[PDB]
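Priority: medium. Attachment 1 of 2:
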């Protein structure tokens, strides 16, 4: 049946309730960037070397000092138990099997501790939102430290939620049996019994809970709060990337939030070279947005990314078959990436060079 990532999305549309599929699929507004995140990869053309000896292709690399089996990691996607009863527990188990890392959403339907218990040997990182309540925010960071998470990815592109039109039409909220499990109060847990207005429930949750005032001073606060590596997630400008380096951060995740925040920003693959240039080798640079195929991974590494993160494909894996479905999606990406390396003449990730691509 399902042999590529597109097949998993098509299957997910056939089995998920509309409101859930739409929440996961949607971009902001007219979804111009959503289309471009994919189309932009196709404009970058590959210039493969022949006759390089590719009998033994090594996909392994490192993310912030921690070894991974491939430069393909799981990005934070909220509320995974909407897709499959086991949600984030299924995802972390699959990541452990693959030897890759899982970035856990602050808006997960499973707690920091529950995910660590399900994937004790998995490489795990926490995606952090800065809540108006700094005591909540600190508690999340402290729990990530205690529970063996290896970095914080602080999201910097969401002072307010983007306007996802289907979520407004559908009046998106959690199904009755689920909660954001990192929080205790009805509002912070996004209880679907709380009053979140007449439009998208999630946009109202953000407006109530998440601090629109945050600034570089809050990054200074976070840098002093934890010794863990910190990655700025959602940077699209070289000047902001340089500022993140000046604040002592340890990486940049070039991201447009899966095209869900400001519509009409460029595709991440198109802004990646500016960001790689701007940081001058001082920190690792990662990419997410539109990764669906092994050749997308190859292109991102050729342009200087250390690794890429996948969002929606993971959710579609869950919707098919929980842990097994996430494992299948990651195995397809790994095999497509191996083949793309081999056909391009690359024995290992260290020889994936800039001459492999042109736009
Ligand atoms: C359904 C969904 C939920 C998401 N939830 C979060 C979140 O909780 N925190 C966050 O920082 N980013 C979140 N993102 C953004 C992703 O981390 C990532 O940037 C994006 O999914 C990458 O693009 P892709 O879906 O094309 O792979 C979400 C994205 C999607 C599609
Ligand atoms: O606080 C630090 C160091 C951190 C501390 C923890 C581990 C890595 C670096 N740097 C900083 C803070 C504010 C403004 N400029 C620099």
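Attachment 2 of 2:
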């Amino acid at each position: 049946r399902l042999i590529c990532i597109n097949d998993y999305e098509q299957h997910a549309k056939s089995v998920l309730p509309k409101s859930i599929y739409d929440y996961y699929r949607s971009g902001a507004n007219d979804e111009e960037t959503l289309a471009d995140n994919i189309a932009a990869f196709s404009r970058w053309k590959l210039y493969p070397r022949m006759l390089r000896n590719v009998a033994e292709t090594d996909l392994s690399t490192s993310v912030l000092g921690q070894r991974v089996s491939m430069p393909i990691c799981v990005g934070a996607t909220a509320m995974q138990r909407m897709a499959h009863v086991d949600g984030e527990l299924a995802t972390v188990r699959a990541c452990q099997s693959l030897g890759t890392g899982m970035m856990l959403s602050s808006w997960a339907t499973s707690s920091i501790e529950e995910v660590a218990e399900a994937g004790p040997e998995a490489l795990r990182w926490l995606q952090l939102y800065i809540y108006k309540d700094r005591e909540v925010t600190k508690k999340l960071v402290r729990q990530a430290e205690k529970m063996g998470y290896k970095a914080i990815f602080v999201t910097v592109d969401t002072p307010y939620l983007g306007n996802r039109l289907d979520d407004v039409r559908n009046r998106f909220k959690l199904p009755p049996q689920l909660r954001m499990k990192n929080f205790e109060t009805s509002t912070l847990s996004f209880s679907p019994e709380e009053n979140f207005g007449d439009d998208s429930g999630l946009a109202a949750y953000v407006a109530k809970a998440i601090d629109p005032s945050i600034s570089w001073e809050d990054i200074k606060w976070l840098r002093r709060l934890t010794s863990l590596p910190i990655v700025a997630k959602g940077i699209l400008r070289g000047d902001d990337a340089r500022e993140a380096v000046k604040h002592g951060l340890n990486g940049i995740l070039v991201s447009n939030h899966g095209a869900r925040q400001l519509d009409g920003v460029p595709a991440t693959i198109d802004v990646l070279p500016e960001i790689v240039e701007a940081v001058e080798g001082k920190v690792e640079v990662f990419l997410d947005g539109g990764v669906r195929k092994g050749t997308d991974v190859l292109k991102a590494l050729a342009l200087g990314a250390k690794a890429v993160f996948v969002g929606r494909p993971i959710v579609w894996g869950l919707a098919f078959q929980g842990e097994k479905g996430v494992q299948d999606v990651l195995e397809i990406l790994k095999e497509e990436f191996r083949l793309a390396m081999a056909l391009s003449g690359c024995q290992n990730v260290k020889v994936i060079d800039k001459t492999l691509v042109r736009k």
